[PDB]
Amino acid sequence: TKHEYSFGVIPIRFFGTPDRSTLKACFICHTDGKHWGFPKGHAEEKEGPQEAAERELVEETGLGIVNFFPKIFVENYSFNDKEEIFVRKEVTYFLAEVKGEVHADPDEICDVQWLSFQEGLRLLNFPEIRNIVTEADKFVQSYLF
Ligand SMILES: Nc1ncnc2c1ncn2[C@@H]1O[C@H](COP(=O)(O)O)[C@@H](O)[C@H]1O
Ligand SMILES: [Cl-]
Ligand SMILES: [Mg+2]
Ligand SMILES: [Mg+2]
Ligand SMILES: [Mg+2]
Protein backbone atom coordinates (compact mmCIF):
# COMPACT_ATOMS: atom_id res chain seq x y z
CA THR A 1 0.00 0.00 0.00
CA LYS A 2 2.29 2.74 -1.33
CA HIS A 3 2.06 6.54 -1.39
CA GLU A 4 2.93 8.39 -4.60
CA TYR A 5 3.59 12.14 -4.94
CA SER A 6 3.53 14.13 -8.19
CA PHE A 7 3.93 17.71 -9.35
CA GLY A 8 2.55 19.32 -12.47
CA VAL A 9 1.60 22.49 -14.28
CA ILE A 10 -1.71 23.72 -15.65
CA PRO A 11 -0.27 25.53 -18.71
CA ILE A 12 -2.28 28.53 -19.95
CA ARG A 13 -1.89 30.99 -22.78
CA PHE A 14 -3.91 33.81 -24.35
CA PHE A 15 -4.73 33.37 -28.04
CA GLY A 16 -5.16 37.11 -28.54
CA THR A 17 -5.88 40.11 -26.34
CA PRO A 18 -6.15 38.61 -22.80
CA ASP A 19 -9.74 38.10 -21.60
CA ARG A 20 -12.15 35.38 -20.46
CA SER A 21 -12.89 34.36 -24.06
CA THR A 22 -9.21 34.03 -25.08
CA LEU A 23 -7.63 32.06 -22.21
CA LYS A 24 -6.80 28.47 -23.13
CA ALA A 25 -5.11 25.68 -21.22
CA CYS A 26 -2.99 22.83 -22.57
CA PHE A 27 -4.96 19.63 -21.98
CA ILE A 28 -2.98 16.42 -22.64
CA CYS A 29 -3.86 12.77 -23.06
CA HIS A 30 -1.77 10.41 -20.93
CA THR A 31 -0.09 7.64 -22.96
CA ASP A 32 -0.34 5.30 -19.96
CA GLY A 33 -4.11 5.05 -19.59
CA LYS A 34 -5.46 7.40 -22.29
CA HIS A 35 -7.19 9.63 -19.71
CA TRP A 36 -6.90 13.40 -19.99
CA GLY A 37 -5.27 15.84 -17.60
CA PHE A 38 -2.24 18.09 -17.34
CA PRO A 39 1.52 17.36 -17.47
CA LYS A 40 2.92 16.07 -14.17
CA GLY A 41 5.57 13.85 -12.70
CA HIS A 42 7.84 12.81 -9.90
CA ALA A 43 10.37 14.98 -8.11
CA GLU A 44 14.01 14.03 -8.54
CA GLU A 45 16.06 13.62 -5.37
CA LYS A 46 16.09 16.81 -3.26
CA GLU A 47 14.16 18.73 -5.95
CA GLY A 48 11.59 21.26 -4.75
CA PRO A 49 7.97 20.78 -5.93
CA GLN A 50 8.02 23.82 -8.26
CA GLU A 51 11.36 22.77 -9.74
CA ALA A 52 9.99 19.28 -10.32
CA ALA A 53 6.83 20.71 -11.91
CA GLU A 54 8.83 22.98 -14.28
CA ARG A 55 11.18 20.19 -15.36
CA GLU A 56 8.33 17.73 -15.96
CA LEU A 57 6.46 20.30 -18.10
CA VAL A 58 9.55 20.98 -20.27
CA GLU A 59 10.36 17.28 -20.56
CA GLU A 60 6.82 16.29 -21.58
CA THR A 61 5.71 19.23 -23.81
CA GLY A 62 8.73 21.46 -24.54
CA LEU A 63 6.81 24.46 -23.09
CA GLY A 64 8.65 27.10 -21.05
CA ILE A 65 7.37 29.17 -18.13
CA VAL A 66 6.56 32.83 -18.68
CA ASN A 67 5.21 33.44 -15.14
CA PHE A 68 3.73 31.34 -12.36
CA PHE A 69 0.48 32.49 -10.84
CA PRO A 70 0.25 32.64 -6.99
CA LYS A 71 -1.95 29.59 -6.74
CA ILE A 72 -1.73 25.83 -6.46
CA PHE A 73 -4.30 23.04 -6.75
CA VAL A 74 -4.17 19.61 -5.09
CA GLU A 75 -5.89 16.29 -5.86
CA ASN A 76 -5.89 12.95 -4.05
CA TYR A 77 -6.96 9.66 -5.62
CA SER A 78 -6.32 5.92 -5.27
CA PHE A 79 -5.86 3.10 -7.77
CA ASN A 80 -4.29 -0.31 -8.32
CA ASP A 81 -1.13 -0.40 -10.43
CA LYS A 82 0.08 -2.82 -13.13
CA GLU A 83 1.27 -5.26 -10.44
CA GLU A 84 -2.05 -4.90 -8.53
CA ILE A 85 -0.61 -2.78 -5.64
CA PHE A 86 -2.99 -0.26 -4.04
CA VAL A 87 -1.64 3.29 -4.48
CA ARG A 88 -2.64 6.51 -2.75
CA LYS A 89 -1.55 9.37 -4.99
CA GLU A 90 -1.30 13.10 -4.34
CA VAL A 91 -0.79 15.52 -7.24
CA THR A 92 0.08 19.18 -6.79
CA TYR A 93 -0.52 21.46 -9.80
CA PHE A 94 1.06 24.83 -10.30
CA LEU A 95 -0.57 27.28 -12.73
CA ALA A 96 1.58 29.12 -15.24
CA GLU A 97 1.41 31.28 -18.34
CA VAL A 98 3.60 29.40 -20.85
CA LYS A 99 5.38 30.01 -24.15
CA GLY A 100 6.72 27.90 -27.00
CA GLU A 101 5.20 25.50 -29.47
CA VAL A 102 4.06 22.21 -27.96
CA HIS A 103 6.25 19.20 -28.83
CA ALA A 104 4.83 16.29 -26.85
CA ASP A 105 7.05 13.47 -25.67
CA PRO A 106 5.08 10.50 -27.13
CA ASP A 107 6.25 8.19 -24.30
CA GLU A 108 4.00 10.15 -21.93
CA ILE A 109 1.67 12.36 -24.02
CA CYS A 110 -0.32 10.94 -26.92
CA ASP A 111 -2.65 13.89 -27.64
CA VAL A 112 -2.79 17.65 -26.96
CA GLN A 113 -5.58 20.20 -27.07
CA TRP A 114 -5.59 23.91 -26.20
CA LEU A 115 -9.08 24.46 -24.76
CA SER A 116 -10.99 26.73 -22.44
CA PHE A 117 -11.41 25.25 -18.98
CA GLN A 118 -15.10 24.57 -19.74
CA GLU A 119 -14.34 22.91 -23.11
CA GLY A 120 -11.61 20.79 -21.57
CA LEU A 121 -13.93 19.69 -18.74
CA ARG A 122 -15.84 17.63 -21.34
CA LEU A 123 -12.72 15.45 -21.77
CA LEU A 124 -12.49 14.63 -18.04
CA ASN A 125 -14.20 11.68 -16.32
CA PHE A 126 -12.45 11.20 -12.94
CA PRO A 127 -14.08 13.46 -10.29
CA GLU A 128 -10.80 14.61 -8.70
CA ILE A 129 -9.39 16.22 -11.86
CA ARG A 130 -12.83 17.71 -12.65
CA ASN A 131 -12.66 19.43 -9.25
CA ILE A 132 -9.20 20.77 -10.22
CA VAL A 133 -10.45 22.36 -13.44
CA THR A 134 -13.58 23.70 -11.70
CA GLU A 135 -11.38 25.40 -9.10
CA ALA A 136 -8.96 26.70 -11.76
CA ASP A 137 -11.79 28.17 -13.79
CA LYS A 138 -13.11 29.80 -10.60
CA PHE A 139 -9.65 31.22 -9.88
CA VAL A 140 -8.90 32.80 -13.26
CA GLN A 141 -12.31 34.51 -13.18
CA SER A 142 -11.72 36.12 -9.78
CA TYR A 143 -7.97 36.75 -10.24
CA LEU A 144 -7.88 38.09 -13.82
CA PHE A 145 -11.44 38.71 -15.06
N1 LIG B 1 -8.93 10.35 -10.22
C1 LIG B 1 -8.54 8.98 -10.42
N2 LIG B 1 -9.23 8.00 -9.78
C2 LIG B 1 -8.90 6.71 -9.94
N3 LIG B 1 -7.91 6.35 -10.74
C3 LIG B 1 -7.18 7.27 -11.45
C4 LIG B 1 -7.48 8.64 -11.31
N4 LIG B 1 -6.60 9.33 -12.10
C5 LIG B 1 -5.79 8.45 -12.69
N5 LIG B 1 -6.13 7.21 -12.31
C6 LIG B 1 -5.47 5.98 -12.73
O1 LIG B 1 -4.23 5.89 -12.04
C7 LIG B 1 -3.20 5.38 -12.92
C8 LIG B 1 -2.11 6.41 -13.04
O2 LIG B 1 -2.59 7.61 -13.63
P1 LIG B 1 -1.75 8.96 -13.54
O3 LIG B 1 -1.47 9.23 -12.05
O4 LIG B 1 -2.64 10.08 -14.08
O5 LIG B 1 -0.44 8.73 -14.29
C9 LIG B 1 -3.91 5.02 -14.23
O6 LIG B 1 -4.35 3.67 -14.15
C10 LIG B 1 -5.13 5.93 -14.22
O7 LIG B 1 -6.22 5.43 -14.95
CL1 LIG C 1 2.90 11.24 -12.21
MG1 LIG D 1 4.35 12.58 -16.28
MG1 LIG E 1 7.18 12.79 -17.02
MG1 LIG F 1 9.72 12.09 -14.31
mmCIF file of C-alpha atoms and ligand atoms in Angstrom:
data_model
loop_
_atom_site.group_PDB
_atom_site.id
_atom_site.type_symbol
_atom_site.label_atom_id
_atom_site.label_comp_id
_atom_site.label_asym_id
_atom_site.label_seq_id
_atom_site.Cartn_x
_atom_site.Cartn_y
_atom_site.Cartn_z
ATOM 1 C CA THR A 1 0.000 0.000 0.000
ATOM 2 C CA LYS A 2 2.285 2.738 -1.328
ATOM 3 C CA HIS A 3 2.058 6.537 -1.388
ATOM 4 C CA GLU A 4 2.927 8.389 -4.604
ATOM 5 C CA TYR A 5 3.594 12.141 -4.943
ATOM 6 C CA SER A 6 3.525 14.126 -8.186
ATOM 7 C CA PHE A 7 3.935 17.708 -9.347
ATOM 8 C CA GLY A 8 2.548 19.324 -12.472
ATOM 9 C CA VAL A 9 1.601 22.493 -14.278
ATOM 10 C CA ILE A 10 -1.711 23.718 -15.646
ATOM 11 C CA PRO A 11 -0.272 25.526 -18.713
ATOM 12 C CA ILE A 12 -2.276 28.526 -19.949
ATOM 13 C CA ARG A 13 -1.894 30.994 -22.781
ATOM 14 C CA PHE A 14 -3.910 33.808 -24.353
ATOM 15 C CA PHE A 15 -4.728 33.368 -28.042
ATOM 16 C CA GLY A 16 -5.163 37.112 -28.538
ATOM 17 C CA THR A 17 -5.881 40.106 -26.339
ATOM 18 C CA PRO A 18 -6.150 38.614 -22.803
ATOM 19 C CA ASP A 19 -9.742 38.096 -21.600
ATOM 20 C CA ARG A 20 -12.145 35.379 -20.460
ATOM 21 C CA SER A 21 -12.886 34.358 -24.065
ATOM 22 C CA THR A 22 -9.213 34.026 -25.085
ATOM 23 C CA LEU A 23 -7.626 32.061 -22.211
ATOM 24 C CA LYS A 24 -6.798 28.467 -23.126
ATOM 25 C CA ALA A 25 -5.109 25.681 -21.218
ATOM 26 C CA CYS A 26 -2.987 22.829 -22.568
ATOM 27 C CA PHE A 27 -4.957 19.628 -21.976
ATOM 28 C CA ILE A 28 -2.980 16.425 -22.639
ATOM 29 C CA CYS A 29 -3.864 12.766 -23.063
ATOM 30 C CA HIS A 30 -1.767 10.408 -20.925
ATOM 31 C CA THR A 31 -0.094 7.642 -22.958
ATOM 32 C CA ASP A 32 -0.339 5.305 -19.963
ATOM 33 C CA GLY A 33 -4.105 5.047 -19.595
ATOM 34 C CA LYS A 34 -5.456 7.398 -22.293
ATOM 35 C CA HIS A 35 -7.195 9.626 -19.711
ATOM 36 C CA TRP A 36 -6.902 13.399 -19.988
ATOM 37 C CA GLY A 37 -5.270 15.844 -17.605
ATOM 38 C CA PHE A 38 -2.235 18.091 -17.344
ATOM 39 C CA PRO A 39 1.516 17.364 -17.466
ATOM 40 C CA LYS A 40 2.917 16.073 -14.168
ATOM 41 C CA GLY A 41 5.571 13.854 -12.699
ATOM 42 C CA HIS A 42 7.843 12.805 -9.896
ATOM 43 C CA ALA A 43 10.370 14.976 -8.111
ATOM 44 C CA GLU A 44 14.014 14.029 -8.543
ATOM 45 C CA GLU A 45 16.065 13.619 -5.368
ATOM 46 C CA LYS A 46 16.094 16.806 -3.259
ATOM 47 C CA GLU A 47 14.158 18.732 -5.952
ATOM 48 C CA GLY A 48 11.590 21.261 -4.745
ATOM 49 C CA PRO A 49 7.974 20.783 -5.926
ATOM 50 C CA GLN A 50 8.022 23.824 -8.257
ATOM 51 C CA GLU A 51 11.362 22.771 -9.744
ATOM 52 C CA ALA A 52 9.989 19.282 -10.324
ATOM 53 C CA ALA A 53 6.833 20.714 -11.911
ATOM 54 C CA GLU A 54 8.834 22.977 -14.284
ATOM 55 C CA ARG A 55 11.178 20.193 -15.364
ATOM 56 C CA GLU A 56 8.329 17.729 -15.958
ATOM 57 C CA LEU A 57 6.463 20.302 -18.098
ATOM 58 C CA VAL A 58 9.547 20.981 -20.270
ATOM 59 C CA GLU A 59 10.358 17.281 -20.563
ATOM 60 C CA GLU A 60 6.822 16.292 -21.585
ATOM 61 C CA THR A 61 5.708 19.232 -23.809
ATOM 62 C CA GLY A 62 8.725 21.458 -24.542
ATOM 63 C CA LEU A 63 6.815 24.456 -23.094
ATOM 64 C CA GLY A 64 8.648 27.098 -21.055
ATOM 65 C CA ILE A 65 7.372 29.172 -18.135
ATOM 66 C CA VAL A 66 6.558 32.829 -18.679
ATOM 67 C CA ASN A 67 5.206 33.444 -15.145
ATOM 68 C CA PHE A 68 3.735 31.339 -12.365
ATOM 69 C CA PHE A 69 0.478 32.490 -10.836
ATOM 70 C CA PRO A 70 0.246 32.638 -6.987
ATOM 71 C CA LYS A 71 -1.952 29.587 -6.738
ATOM 72 C CA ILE A 72 -1.734 25.825 -6.460
ATOM 73 C CA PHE A 73 -4.297 23.037 -6.753
ATOM 74 C CA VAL A 74 -4.168 19.605 -5.093
ATOM 75 C CA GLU A 75 -5.893 16.289 -5.862
ATOM 76 C CA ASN A 76 -5.894 12.950 -4.050
ATOM 77 C CA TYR A 77 -6.963 9.663 -5.616
ATOM 78 C CA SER A 78 -6.324 5.924 -5.270
ATOM 79 C CA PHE A 79 -5.864 3.101 -7.770
ATOM 80 C CA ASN A 80 -4.292 -0.312 -8.323
ATOM 81 C CA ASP A 81 -1.126 -0.399 -10.428
ATOM 82 C CA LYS A 82 0.078 -2.817 -13.126
ATOM 83 C CA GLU A 83 1.271 -5.257 -10.435
ATOM 84 C CA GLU A 84 -2.049 -4.903 -8.528
ATOM 85 C CA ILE A 85 -0.614 -2.778 -5.641
ATOM 86 C CA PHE A 86 -2.991 -0.257 -4.044
ATOM 87 C CA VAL A 87 -1.636 3.292 -4.477
ATOM 88 C CA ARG A 88 -2.643 6.513 -2.745
ATOM 89 C CA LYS A 89 -1.554 9.374 -4.992
ATOM 90 C CA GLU A 90 -1.297 13.105 -4.336
ATOM 91 C CA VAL A 91 -0.793 15.517 -7.241
ATOM 92 C CA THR A 92 0.076 19.185 -6.787
ATOM 93 C CA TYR A 93 -0.516 21.464 -9.797
ATOM 94 C CA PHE A 94 1.060 24.834 -10.302
ATOM 95 C CA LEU A 95 -0.574 27.280 -12.731
ATOM 96 C CA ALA A 96 1.584 29.120 -15.245
ATOM 97 C CA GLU A 97 1.411 31.276 -18.342
ATOM 98 C CA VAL A 98 3.603 29.400 -20.847
ATOM 99 C CA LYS A 99 5.380 30.006 -24.151
ATOM 100 C CA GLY A 100 6.723 27.903 -26.999
ATOM 101 C CA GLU A 101 5.200 25.496 -29.470
ATOM 102 C CA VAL A 102 4.059 22.205 -27.964
ATOM 103 C CA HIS A 103 6.246 19.201 -28.830
ATOM 104 C CA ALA A 104 4.828 16.286 -26.855
ATOM 105 C CA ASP A 105 7.046 13.471 -25.673
ATOM 106 C CA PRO A 106 5.078 10.497 -27.125
ATOM 107 C CA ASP A 107 6.246 8.191 -24.303
ATOM 108 C CA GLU A 108 4.001 10.154 -21.932
ATOM 109 C CA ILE A 109 1.670 12.360 -24.016
ATOM 110 C CA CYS A 110 -0.319 10.939 -26.920
ATOM 111 C CA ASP A 111 -2.654 13.890 -27.637
ATOM 112 C CA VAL A 112 -2.786 17.651 -26.955
ATOM 113 C CA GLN A 113 -5.583 20.201 -27.068
ATOM 114 C CA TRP A 114 -5.588 23.905 -26.199
ATOM 115 C CA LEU A 115 -9.084 24.463 -24.763
ATOM 116 C CA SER A 116 -10.986 26.734 -22.439
ATOM 117 C CA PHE A 117 -11.414 25.249 -18.980
ATOM 118 C CA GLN A 118 -15.099 24.568 -19.735
ATOM 119 C CA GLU A 119 -14.342 22.911 -23.108
ATOM 120 C CA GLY A 120 -11.614 20.788 -21.568
ATOM 121 C CA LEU A 121 -13.932 19.687 -18.744
ATOM 122 C CA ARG A 122 -15.838 17.630 -21.337
ATOM 123 C CA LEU A 123 -12.719 15.455 -21.769
ATOM 124 C CA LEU A 124 -12.494 14.631 -18.037
ATOM 125 C CA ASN A 125 -14.198 11.676 -16.323
ATOM 126 C CA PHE A 126 -12.453 11.205 -12.939
ATOM 127 C CA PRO A 127 -14.080 13.463 -10.287
ATOM 128 C CA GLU A 128 -10.804 14.615 -8.696
ATOM 129 C CA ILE A 129 -9.392 16.216 -11.865
ATOM 130 C CA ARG A 130 -12.828 17.709 -12.649
ATOM 131 C CA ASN A 131 -12.656 19.435 -9.248
ATOM 132 C CA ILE A 132 -9.201 20.767 -10.224
ATOM 133 C CA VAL A 133 -10.451 22.356 -13.439
ATOM 134 C CA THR A 134 -13.578 23.698 -11.703
ATOM 135 C CA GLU A 135 -11.380 25.399 -9.104
ATOM 136 C CA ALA A 136 -8.956 26.696 -11.757
ATOM 137 C CA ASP A 137 -11.793 28.171 -13.794
ATOM 138 C CA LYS A 138 -13.106 29.804 -10.603
ATOM 139 C CA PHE A 139 -9.653 31.225 -9.878
ATOM 140 C CA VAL A 140 -8.904 32.799 -13.265
ATOM 141 C CA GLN A 141 -12.311 34.513 -13.179
ATOM 142 C CA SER A 142 -11.716 36.119 -9.777
ATOM 143 C CA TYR A 143 -7.974 36.746 -10.241
ATOM 144 C CA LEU A 144 -7.882 38.086 -13.821
ATOM 145 C CA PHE A 145 -11.436 38.708 -15.060
HETATM 146 N N1 LIG B 1 -8.935 10.347 -10.220
HETATM 147 C C1 LIG B 1 -8.544 8.983 -10.424
HETATM 148 N N2 LIG B 1 -9.227 7.998 -9.781
HETATM 149 C C2 LIG B 1 -8.899 6.715 -9.937
HETATM 150 N N3 LIG B 1 -7.907 6.353 -10.742
HETATM 151 C C3 LIG B 1 -7.179 7.266 -11.449
HETATM 152 C C4 LIG B 1 -7.484 8.643 -11.310
HETATM 153 N N4 LIG B 1 -6.604 9.334 -12.103
HETATM 154 C C5 LIG B 1 -5.794 8.451 -12.695
HETATM 155 N N5 LIG B 1 -6.130 7.207 -12.307
HETATM 156 C C6 LIG B 1 -5.467 5.980 -12.732
HETATM 157 O O1 LIG B 1 -4.231 5.886 -12.035
HETATM 158 C C7 LIG B 1 -3.203 5.382 -12.917
HETATM 159 C C8 LIG B 1 -2.105 6.405 -13.039
HETATM 160 O O2 LIG B 1 -2.587 7.609 -13.625
HETATM 161 P P1 LIG B 1 -1.749 8.963 -13.538
HETATM 162 O O3 LIG B 1 -1.470 9.232 -12.047
HETATM 163 O O4 LIG B 1 -2.638 10.076 -14.084
HETATM 164 O O5 LIG B 1 -0.439 8.728 -14.287
HETATM 165 C C9 LIG B 1 -3.911 5.020 -14.227
HETATM 166 O O6 LIG B 1 -4.349 3.666 -14.148
HETATM 167 C C10 LIG B 1 -5.129 5.932 -14.219
HETATM 168 O O7 LIG B 1 -6.223 5.425 -14.947
HETATM 169 CL CL CL B 2 2.901 11.243 -12.206
HETATM 170 MG MG MG B 3 4.346 12.577 -16.279
HETATM 171 MG MG MG B 4 7.185 12.789 -17.016
HETATM 172 MG MG MG B 5 9.724 12.092 -14.313
#
